[PDB]
Structure 1
């Protein structure tokens, strides 16, 4: 899976969060802008065969599934030291 801009997601979430009047943190971004991306990217995982069996009710045996993620981030003036990057 390729996420074509997490920067633009974070900007949309900043808009939604400011419209709900929530106090912003650094770079006007909300407090949970880390939890936003965390609970997303933590899903790209590889799972062991026991988890696959347990999930799919024994319909599958020995195979290990995986989801691979390549999030894209856009940074201003090559600044790898900004907040969201």
Structure 2
């Protein structure tokens, strides 16, 4: 999210920028872990909807 905001700031003023995301599976795993530990119901593949 911080990377997206930093890119958007430069983009909005007319500065051409390019954004690369290294890995998203780990982000999904971290979000799933924090959701489960927050005591929220699980879904398919123990994933929040």
Q: Normalising by the residue count of structure 2, what TM-score does the alignment of the two structures yield?
A: 0.57
1:45-64 matches, within 5 Å, as none
Structure 1 match to 2:26: 8
Q: Do structure 1's residue 24 and structure 2's residue 42 form an aligned pair?
A: yes
Q: What is the CA RMSD across the aligned residues, in angstroms? A: 0.8
Counterpart Cα distance in 1 of 2:25 and 2:37: 19
Higher helix proportion, which one? Answer: 2
Counterpart Cα distance in 2 of 1:26 and 1:2: 29
Say how many residue pairs are matched: 31
Q: Any stretches of 5+ residues in structure 1 without a counterpart? A: 32-85
Q: Any stretches of 5+ residues in structure 2 without a counterpart? A: 1-18
Q: Which has the higher contact order (CA 8 A, sep 6+)?
A: 1
Which protein is bigger by CA-based radius of gyration?
Answer: 1
Runs of 4+ with deviation above 2 angstroms:
none
